[PDB]
Amino acid sequence: KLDSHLKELRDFMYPEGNTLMLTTPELSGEFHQLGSQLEKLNHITVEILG
Amino acid sequence: KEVQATVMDWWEQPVQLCLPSEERGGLTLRQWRERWTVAVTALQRATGSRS
């Protein structure tokens, strides 16, 4: 039982087997994408004001 | 991109070239602009004021 509990919790926390994951990978990917798109929008804005 | 287009329209004012055959004082707008450009250029040459 102890071995099973340990294996289940570990599988959940280490989805890619090597790294403890605190954020949902799907969410982490979206944050990065949103940050990149905002940086582009800020360039276009600066360029037009200039 | 749309805002950039608006900025462009404000700077070029394209509506001034829409009636070419219209004469006022015996000359067209273009002719008047040309007269203006020659005069502005002559003034700028006299007034040493190198633009």
* C-alpha distances in Å from residue A40, one per residue of A9, A29, A32: 40, 17, 13
- Per-residue HEC secondary structure of chain B comes to CHHHHHHHHHHHCHHHHCCCCCEECCEEHHHHHHHHHHHHHHHHHHCCCCC
Solving technique: cryo-EM
Cβ-based interface (< 8 Å): residues of B facing A: 3-4, 7
Residues of B in contact with A48 (CB under 8 A): 3-4, 7
Q: By the CB < 8 Å criterion, does A48 face chain B?
A: yes
- The amino acid that residue A6 corresponds to is L
Smallest CA-to-CA distance from B17 within B39, B34, B42 is with B34
Compare all CA atoms of chain B with the CA of A49 and give the residue at the minimum distance: B4
Q: What are phi and psi of B23, to 5 degrees?
A: -110, 135
Q: Does A41 touch chain B (CB under 8 A)?
A: no
